[PDB]
Amino acid sequence: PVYVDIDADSAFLKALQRAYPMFEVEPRQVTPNDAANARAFSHLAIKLIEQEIDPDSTILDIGSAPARRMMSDRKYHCVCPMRSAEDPERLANYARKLASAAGKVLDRNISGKIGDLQAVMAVPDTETPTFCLHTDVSCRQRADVAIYQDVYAVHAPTSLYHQAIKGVRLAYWVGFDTTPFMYNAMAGAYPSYSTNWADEQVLKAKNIGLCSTDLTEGRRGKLSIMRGKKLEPCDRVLFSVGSTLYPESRKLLKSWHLPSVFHLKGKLSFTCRCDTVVSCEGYVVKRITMSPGLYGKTTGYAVTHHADGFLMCKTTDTVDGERVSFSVCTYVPATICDQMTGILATEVTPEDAQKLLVGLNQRIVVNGRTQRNTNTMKNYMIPVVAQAFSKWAKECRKDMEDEKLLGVRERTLWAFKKQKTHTVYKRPDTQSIQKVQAEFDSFVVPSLWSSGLSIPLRTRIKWLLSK
Amino acid sequence: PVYVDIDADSAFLKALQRAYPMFEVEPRQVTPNDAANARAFSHLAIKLIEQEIDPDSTILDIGSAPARRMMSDRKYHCVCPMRSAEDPERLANYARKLASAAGKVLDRNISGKIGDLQAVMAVPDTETPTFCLHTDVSCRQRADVAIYQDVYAVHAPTSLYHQAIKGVRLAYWVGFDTTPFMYNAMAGAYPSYSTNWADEQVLKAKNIGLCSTDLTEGRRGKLSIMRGKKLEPCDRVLFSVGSTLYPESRKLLKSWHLPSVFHLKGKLSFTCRCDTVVSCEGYVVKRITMSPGLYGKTTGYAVTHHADGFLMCKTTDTVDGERVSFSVCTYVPATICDQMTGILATEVTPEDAQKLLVGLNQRIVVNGRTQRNTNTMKNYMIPVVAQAFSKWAKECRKDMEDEKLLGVRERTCLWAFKKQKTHTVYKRPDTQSIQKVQAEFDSFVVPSLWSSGLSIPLRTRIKWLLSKVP
Amino acid sequence: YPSYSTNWADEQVLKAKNIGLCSTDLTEGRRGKLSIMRGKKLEPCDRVLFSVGSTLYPESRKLLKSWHLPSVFHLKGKLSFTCRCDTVVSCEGYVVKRITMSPGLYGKTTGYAVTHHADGFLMCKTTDTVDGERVSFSVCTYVPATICDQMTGILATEVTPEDAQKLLVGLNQRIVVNGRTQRNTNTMKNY
Amino acid sequence: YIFSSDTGQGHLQQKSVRQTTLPVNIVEEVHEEKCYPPKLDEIKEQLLLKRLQESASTANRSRYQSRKVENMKAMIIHRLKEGCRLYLASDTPRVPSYRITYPAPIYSPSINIKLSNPETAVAVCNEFLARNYPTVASYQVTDEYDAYLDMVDGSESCLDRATFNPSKLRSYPKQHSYHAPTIRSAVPSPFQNTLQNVLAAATKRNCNVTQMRELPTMDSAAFNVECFKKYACNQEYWREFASSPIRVTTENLTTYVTKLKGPKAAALFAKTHNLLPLQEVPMDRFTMDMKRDVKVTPGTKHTEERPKVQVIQAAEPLATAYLCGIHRELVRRLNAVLLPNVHTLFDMSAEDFDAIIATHFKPGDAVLETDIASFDKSQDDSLALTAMMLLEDLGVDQPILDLIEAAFGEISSCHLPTGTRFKFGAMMKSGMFLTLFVNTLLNITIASRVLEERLTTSACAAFIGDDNIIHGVVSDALMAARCATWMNMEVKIIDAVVSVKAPYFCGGFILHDTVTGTACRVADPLKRLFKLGKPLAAGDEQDEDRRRALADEVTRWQRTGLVTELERAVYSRYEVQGITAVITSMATFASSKENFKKLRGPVVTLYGGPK
Numbered sequence A: 001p002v003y004v005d006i007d008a009d010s011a012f013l014k015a016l017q018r019a020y021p022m023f024e025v026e027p028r029q030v031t032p033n034d035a036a037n038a039r040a041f042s043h044l045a046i047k048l049i050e051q052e053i054d055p056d057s058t059i060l061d062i063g064s065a066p067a068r069r070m071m072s073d074r075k076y077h078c079v080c081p082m083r084s085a086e087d088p089e090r091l092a093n094y095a096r097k098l099a100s101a102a103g104k105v106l107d108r109n110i111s112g113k114i115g116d117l118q119a120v121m122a123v124p125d126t127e128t129p130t131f132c133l134h135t136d137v138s139c140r141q142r143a144d145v146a147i148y149q150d151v152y153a154v155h156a157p158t159s160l161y162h163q164a165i166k167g168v169r170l171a172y173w174v175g176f177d178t179t180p181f182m183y184n185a186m187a188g189a190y191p192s193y194s195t196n197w198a199d200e201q202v203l204k205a206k207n208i209g210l211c212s213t214d215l216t217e218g219r220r221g222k223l224s225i226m227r228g229k230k231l232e233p234c235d236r237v238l239f240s241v242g243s244t245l246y247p248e249s250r251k252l253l254k255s256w257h258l259p260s261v262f263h264l265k266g267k268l269s270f271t272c273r274c275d276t277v278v279s280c281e282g283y284v285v286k287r288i289t290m291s292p293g294l295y296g297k298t299t300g301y302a303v304t305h306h307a308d309g310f311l312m313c314k315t316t317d318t319v320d321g322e323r324v325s326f327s328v329c330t331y332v333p334a335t336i337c338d339q340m341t342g343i344l345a346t347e348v349t350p351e352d353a354q355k356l357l358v359g360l361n362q363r364i365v366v367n368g369r370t371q372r373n374t375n376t377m378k379n380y381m382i383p384v385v386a387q388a389f390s391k392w393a394k395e396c397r398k399d400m401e402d403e404k405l406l407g408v409r410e411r412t413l414w415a416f417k418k419q420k421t422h423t424v425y426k427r428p429d430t431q432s433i434q435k436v437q438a439e440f441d442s443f444v445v446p447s448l449w450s451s452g453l454s455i456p457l458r459t460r461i462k463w464l465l466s467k
Numbered sequence B: 001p002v003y004v005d006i007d008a009d010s011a012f013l014k015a016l017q018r019a020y021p022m023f024e025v026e027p028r029q030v031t032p033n034d035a036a037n038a039r040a041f042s043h044l045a046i047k048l049i050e051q052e053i054d055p056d057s058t059i060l061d062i063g064s065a066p067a068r069r070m071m072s073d074r075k076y077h078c079v080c081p082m083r084s085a086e087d088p089e090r091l092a093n094y095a096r097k098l099a100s101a102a103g104k105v106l107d108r109n110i111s112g113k114i115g116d117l118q119a120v121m122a123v124p125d126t127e128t129p130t131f132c133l134h135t136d137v138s139c140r141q142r143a144d145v146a147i148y149q150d151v152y153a154v155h156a157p158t159s160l161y162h163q164a165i166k167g168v169r170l171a172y173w174v175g176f177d178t179t180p181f182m183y184n185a186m187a188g189a190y191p192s193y194s195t196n197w198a199d200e201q202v203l204k205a206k207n208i209g210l211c212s213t214d215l216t217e218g219r220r221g222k223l224s225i226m227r228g229k230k231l232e233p234c235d236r237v238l239f240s241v242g243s244t245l246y247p248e249s250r251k252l253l254k255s256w257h258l259p260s261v262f263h264l265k266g267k268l269s270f271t272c273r274c275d276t277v278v279s280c281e282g283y284v285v286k287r288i289t290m291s292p293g294l295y296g297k298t299t300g301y302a303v304t305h306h307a308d309g310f311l312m313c314k315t316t317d318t319v320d321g322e323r324v325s326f327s328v329c330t331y332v333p334a335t336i337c338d339q340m341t342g343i344l345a346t347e348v349t350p351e352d353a354q355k356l357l358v359g360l361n362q363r364i365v366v367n368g369r370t371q372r373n374t375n376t377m378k379n380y381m382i383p384v385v386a387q388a389f390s391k392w393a394k395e396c397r398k399d400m401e402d403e404k405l406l407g408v409r410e411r412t413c414l415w416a417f418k419k420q421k422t423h424t425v426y427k428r429p430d431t432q433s434i435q436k437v438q439a440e441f442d443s444f445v446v447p448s449l450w451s452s453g454l455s456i457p458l459r460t461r462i463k464w465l466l467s468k469v470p
Numbered sequence C: 001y002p003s004y005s006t007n008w009a010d011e012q013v014l015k016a017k018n019i020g021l022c023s024t025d026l027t028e029g030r031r032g033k034l035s036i037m038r039g040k041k042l043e044p045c046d047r048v049l050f051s052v053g054s055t056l057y058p059e060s061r062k063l064l065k066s067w068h069l070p071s072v073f074h075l076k077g078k079l080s081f082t083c084r085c086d087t088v089v090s091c092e093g094y095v096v097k098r099i100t101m102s103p104g105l106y107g108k109t110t111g112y113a114v115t116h117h118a119d120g121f122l123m124c125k126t127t128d129t130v131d132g133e134r135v136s137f138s139v140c141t142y143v144p145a146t147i148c149d150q151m152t153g154i155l156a157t158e159v160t161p162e163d164a165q166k167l168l169v170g171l172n173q174r175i176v177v178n179g180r181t182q183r184n185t186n187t188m189k190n191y
Numbered sequence D: 001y002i003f004s005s006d007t008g009q010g011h012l013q014q015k016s017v018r019q020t021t022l023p024v025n026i027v028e029e030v031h032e033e034k035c036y037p038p039k040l041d042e043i044k045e046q047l048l049l050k051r052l053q054e055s056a057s058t059a060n061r062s063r064y065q066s067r068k069v070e071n072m073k074a075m076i077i078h079r080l081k082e083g084c085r086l087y088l089a090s091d092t093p094r095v096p097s098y099r100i101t102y103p104a105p106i107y108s109p110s111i112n113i114k115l116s117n118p119e120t121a122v123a124v125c126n127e128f129l130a131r132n133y134p135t136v137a138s139y140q141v142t143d144e145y146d147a148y149l150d151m152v153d154g155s156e157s158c159l160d161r162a163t164f165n166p167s168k169l170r171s172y173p174k175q176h177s178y179h180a181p182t183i184r185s186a187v188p189s190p191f192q193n194t195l196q197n198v199l200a201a202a203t204k205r206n207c208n209v210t211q212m213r214e215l216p217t218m219d220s221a222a223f224n225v226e227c228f229k230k231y232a233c234n235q236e237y238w239r240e241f242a243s244s245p246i247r248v249t250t251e252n253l254t255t256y257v258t259k260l261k262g263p264k265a266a267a268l269f270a271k272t273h274n275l276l277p278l279q280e281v282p283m284d285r286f287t288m289d290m291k292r293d294v295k296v297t298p299g300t301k302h303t304e305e306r307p308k309v310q311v312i313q314a315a316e317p318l319a320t321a322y323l324c325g326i327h328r329e330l331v332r333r334l335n336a337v338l339l340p341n342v343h344t345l346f347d348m349s350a351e352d353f354d355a356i357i358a359t360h361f362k363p364g365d366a367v368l369e370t371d372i373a374s375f376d377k378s379q380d381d382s383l384a385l386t387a388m389m390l391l392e393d394l395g396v397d398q399p400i401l402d403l404i405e406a407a408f409g410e411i412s413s414c415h416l417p418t419g420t421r422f423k424f425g426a427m428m429k430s431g432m433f434l435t436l437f438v439n440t441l442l443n444i445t446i447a448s449r450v451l452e453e454r455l456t457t458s459a460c461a462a463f464i465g466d467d468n469i470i471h472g473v474v475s476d477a478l479m480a481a482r483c484a485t486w487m488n489m490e491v492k493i494i495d496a497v498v499s500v501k502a503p504y505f506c507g508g509f510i511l512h513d514t515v516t517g518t519a520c521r522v523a524d525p526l527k528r529l530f531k532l533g534k535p536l537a538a539g540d541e542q543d544e545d546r547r548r549a550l551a552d553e554v555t556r557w558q559r560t561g562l563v564t565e566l567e568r569a570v571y572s573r574y575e576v577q578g579i580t581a582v583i584t585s586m587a588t589f590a591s592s593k594e595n596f597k598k599l600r601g602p603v604v605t606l607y608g609g610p611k
């Protein structure tokens, strides 16, 4: 059995059990964390990965926290460079736990870890079978398995190649779904995990998940001479998981949407594949297998499978007092989507759609008995979803009144009119396809390694380990 | 008893039990795969074949992965060219499993499989009674049974002839039904197995099962110099089973729609037959027999039996901002088709038909025992299906309001006739379809030049894995 | 032959639209269709195709009609015989016939064949579209006895085709509970 | 229904026949009411129709309908008389009967108290609901999408001996327009006519088999009639009644048809062309009707479970017209054989009931009220034999009994829109023209057998339908042991005490006045209060008969000497406080036409309009 930090009467328990049919999940709450759902999935994903790999295999770990792998009976090599504000705190915590447990546990051979950690502190350049201060493209340790957990700060084709030339034949990735960023959207949400993300230019909106505004009476205008007749997404995205803020980049996010088959070329040639094994309401787990040589041919296509509805529509808001328009995206539960099939056969106003959605969500009746406040989906996303269905129904009817002939395209004045699209809706059990690049040959090696430690910091760990 | 990897609450268990009445099926779920239904059918198909084959007989396996034939107590001869992008992964997995259990059981000729695998690694051009690195044409092993499992990349008349001249008298084929591709359609679906396919020219559609588009506002026109003004099916076709992508070609797909009897004429002559033994909502199993000599005569017809409804209608959609029209095909459950008989006696609008279908898609329970399921058909195909029924009813009323005379076909000096519109084709359950194909073949061309496809680093890795025999 | 999933059709109507054994394709309608010949007559030919289940059997009309023997016939040659034909088993299309042959020459021949009906036989005129051109021919089928008995009162007056279809559907599909025995049966095929 | 319906039509009459101008009870004689024979005249209609065209302000039209309806009544009599030639008879000398009269009742003065602003009345009513019923006042958060929610979930049923077509089971909602209510009581809308609702209504399983007409069944019936005739009837009329039968007579048909109204006569006339004879009309074939209104009681039970669907089994239209002339004679004979202290609500009015119980109920008196609704009359076949034995003793002619008996055996029902067939065994509740009479007879018999001689020595007993009240009777173990022969939940009994726990009878309260010192009966205010929270269908113009009914009911509530008693009676029954303010709120609503418009709102349309 596996214990998770989840309330015993939550609706997420059923979803977790369905996604992991090989375990036995039980709830045990010890802290009122604001991101409990996001941590339960990560805990189960790691356990599944360890179960399928055989023992006595060296495992790399890119950008990890050493304190998490202390009590594991596996070989780990933590690559921990010092390039984040949360790194010095993690190192101090690792040393404190290591010294406190010295002696009480004997089957986890932490005595070797303590002394070996002392060696790297004295000289911050030597290699070590458990710790290092290098990067992914600078470490020179040889292994066969690499693990990525919530990493969005590296370039996937470049990082993977440097691991393959060291005898690595397997890789894993855990993180958010990349599909919303391939549609070039402006804002979105992950309702099941209390996650909201927005672009840099819409941080002063009024009716989105992540925004803040003020009160105004209405003036003539600003002293603006620049025209600025463009509002397009840029390469700057802000994430918010619960109460924690994370800045990200668009180019590095889209680089992880790898195709099915692609080739790596250079000094040595490799061929590899990418597959998806676990998917639950936004979190996915990807497995990559690499082989030496060059076989087959590529096509450059990526396929995504939707187990629940995916929506993207155009909305009008007021940013800093001025009306603008942009696009948003969200997820919809499968049960709600199936129950709306009949009503979208007609033309419905947004008011009628909104009232119907509320009744289905809060006052559902089963077996002749009413269940109050089931709350299948969060209420703050209903207004935007209701408008999306209204536009979708209108567009379908216009297509039925413009019947054309079979296998022809009219040309008289030889230009063809393009129609307007305001809503993209993907039903459950429907696949989406995108075009990407599947041929990579160019790589760059920094070869500019330099330590990032400090004298006062090094003294702190030395004092802790010299008890 | 036979165990399958599906959950106990699925509605697909009843269909599997009906198509396999000689087995006892129980569910046991250990993996949340997205293609559970497709994998379950293939597992049961292999078990049935093994019960019809006389033992102590060697079997060829074209394009096989030798990892799943390791525990079988038969004589398999895998033919594994190094042509696809998944082959290196399969070969490494096969070697790892062989060495990891070389002494635990040692009851399925494990030592022999290791010994001849090493021999092939030394000399590429070598024939062993268990493994080889040739193609279906260049192989030299002699057998009498051939098995094809999900093969769509070979020409059937050419491949079958090369097996026949080597003593093969029986063959099997497992795969998807090829009926939709004989109608020259643009897109289709297999809802029961979560499979969607589409032509490469319509990948930017809006309301089909495999597409993707963007949001636009509407601009006057595009300065596209290349003007075709034609929209016809092409060779390239894309498949999507679960979350996996497979490219296919129409010419090879259509070559497996064989007639009842056909003749193969070359340096030696053979007579062949083809029958269907298992059919379940899209998957079929075919048995082919060969015999030397020429007997009887041929007609050149193929017959398909429909246990459920089959539709092929015309729809209008916008591809990359431009409005066009093409054809879409699908399957319908038999129960839905039966209960629509009374409604389609008159003219009905698409709006009304959609409402009726939704109401018929609800459960009926009497005295605690169910009579109708809660979801007979998936909801993402209802809009297109309801449209097809509307046009079909309209075309039937016009036919019965214009009567001709018996035995006279009117063609009105110059005499000419008129063709009428046909926007939908509906094949009701318990109805057969007949097509015209070719039955005589005399040409068998081959490259006649084989080249190795194994690299040195791969050879060293395989040998290293087998080096540690304990 | 609805009870045995058997459909047969002539070789000239294989491209029909609404029969058991046919197949067609989508079109849009054309006015300038011209042909080399001007055939204006449509009679059945000698070639017929059978389909039992999923198996095809070519057949000939003359050979099929040669087994509809009379009750008494004479075989005259070097040796003369008198023969008889009887039907002993019949079930919705299949029959078992017994023939007794004796040497000599006795009696007198008449030249009539008798068939007894137990279910019901129909043959009417239908209008279909063959290869995009609209023509008319004749079809035949078998009907169960229970359905025929319950339609006696309705056909006293004149009925429209749409009214008759709705009555037939209601009589066909039924569910009976009657305590602890549910049936959910269908009397005849819906196509 | 019984006293008065929502539109003030009721089942009782409005003519007093039990009133006297003396301070003592006086026995009198029962007389007969002469009826005017209709006559036919066609020349008058022709000239009046032409004179209708030239000038018709308001009364000229009325003369046409009166002439037209009068012609129809004469035609019905002529056609109906010819059908029953084998059963028609003449008038025999009648048996005289006598009845007791009572002095007139005395009432206390009434003072009207009302508010001014109609919006404040709504606020007071809403505040009353929230304070006492928290869950009921928070149910409504959106529109009325009950039909859609019923379609999303499947159909669950418990049938027996039924057939239906599965291809016609589809329940997509149709257009629905109504007015938004102002009172926050969640009274549901009437159900839609679908196959799903029909199967849900017929989810009753009464499959029980016993001895049909064998010796054990007859023995139980023989004892039941013995108890009825020994403990509830006198012996001065049985031998005379047996000698004189009751048969179909021209006077019975002439009197019956003349009492029908306009639209009812026209409907009957339309079914007289192909007139079947009396012996040809089947008596065991019924049709199914759904059009009803849901019944709701005070409390919180309709916000958690869906209410049931009501159905009507209608008999042959000609069956209820040939034999419906014998109901009056049966009522007269039954009243003649009952004891003076046993009463039946048939052939009375509201005023007559008050005068009877004027000086019988006093504070500190025990009253026993019992209902027999929760009883399966289909399990035992002796319940039907007992009714027939009582009918035979009353003097019903023999061939007529066979026709009546045919409707109390195996019957079948059919639903015309869907062609659904149902079969039922022995059934007591139906839509025939002897339903209240047989139920009243069985109710008296059950009480007489259980109570034995305690029914004879009593002050006042009233029986009607499935309800009864008996004065001066308490609950003991003897009646429990007697009634526990088969099971225990045959009947439900409740003990009541005057001025402490007010007795309940026919949806009303029995209270003892303080100023005058007499008993009286008033209506239930909470039942009315929940009823104003019912949505009104669009296109309905019946918002004037309800105001008059409310005005009459409000006046009876504000009588002096009954305000304090009404407060205690409601609290002891429903455990609710603060009903004087609600009554005051009702007073201002029923004061003017415009004041009644504050209970409605804007029109809402659902499932309609392709826009």
Ligand SMILES: Nc1nc2c(ncn2[C@@H]2O[C@H](COP(=O)(O)OP(=O)(O)OP(=O)(O)O)[C@@H](O)[C@H]2O)c(=O)[nH]1
Binding pocket: A035, A038, A039, A042, A086, A150, A151, A152, A239, A241, A244, A246, A248
């Ligand atoms: N966009 C983004 N999300 C992250 C990143 N790192 C972690 N997350 C996610 O944020 C969620 C919040 O969980 P955390 O409390 O941060 O996990 P933790 O490492 O145990 O605790 P911390 O020290 O706060 O990071 C995690 O489950 C991650 O899935 C990141 O770098 N970028």
Ligand SMILES: Nc1nc2c(ncn2[C@@H]2O[C@H](COP(=O)(O)OP(=O)(O)OP(=O)(O)O)[C@@H](O)[C@H]2O)c(=O)[nH]1
Binding pocket: B035, B038, B039, B042, B065, B086, B150, B151, B152, B239, B241, B244, B246, B248
């Ligand atoms: N169109 C097409 N379908 C295939 C092909 N190979 C397999 N399939 C189908 O895809 C389904 C899933 O394949 P798997 O059983 O998972 O094969 P695997 O050995 O486990 O590894 P993968 O092929 O990478 O999934 C199979 O059941 C087949 O029905 C192919 O070559 N072409």
Ligand SMILES: Nc1ncnc2c1ncn2[C@@H]1O[C@H](COP(=O)(O)OP(=O)(O)OP(=O)(O)O)[C@@H](O)[C@H]1O
Binding pocket: A062, A063, A064, A079, A080, A081, A082, A083, A084, A085, A087, A135, A136, A137, A152, A153, A154, A246, A247, A248
């Ligand atoms: N080669 C690498 N490059 C950058 N970061 C790495 C690398 N290897 C490991 N990491 C770890 O990635 C983590 C993320 O650090 P990052 O450079 O992205 O700064 P950040 O802005 O605080 O995080 P983020 O951009 O994800 O919001 C660091 O803790 C770092 O130790």
Ligand SMILES: Nc1ncnc2c1ncn2[C@@H]1O[C@H](COP(=O)(O)OP(=O)(O)OP(=O)(O)O)[C@@H](O)[C@H]1O
Binding pocket: A296, A297, B062, B063, B064, B079, B080, B081, B082, B083, B084, B085, B087, B135, B136, B137, B152, B153, B154, B245, B246, B247, B248
């Ligand atoms: N004569 C043959 N020609 C091609 N493939 C063969 C042949 N014989 C066996 N095979 C097997 O078929 C597989 C090759 O399939 P293919 O080259 O079409 O891969 P692909 O490019 O992904 O396209 P597809 O979707 O059809 O599989 C290999 O596994 C191979 O072992």
Ligand SMILES: [Zn+2]
Binding pocket: A077, A078, A079, A127, A128, A131, A132, A133, A134, A139, A140, A141
């Ligand atoms: Zn390192």
Ligand SMILES: [Zn+2]
Binding pocket: B077, B078, B079, B127, B131, B132, B133, B134, B139, B140, B141
């Ligand atoms: Zn070989």
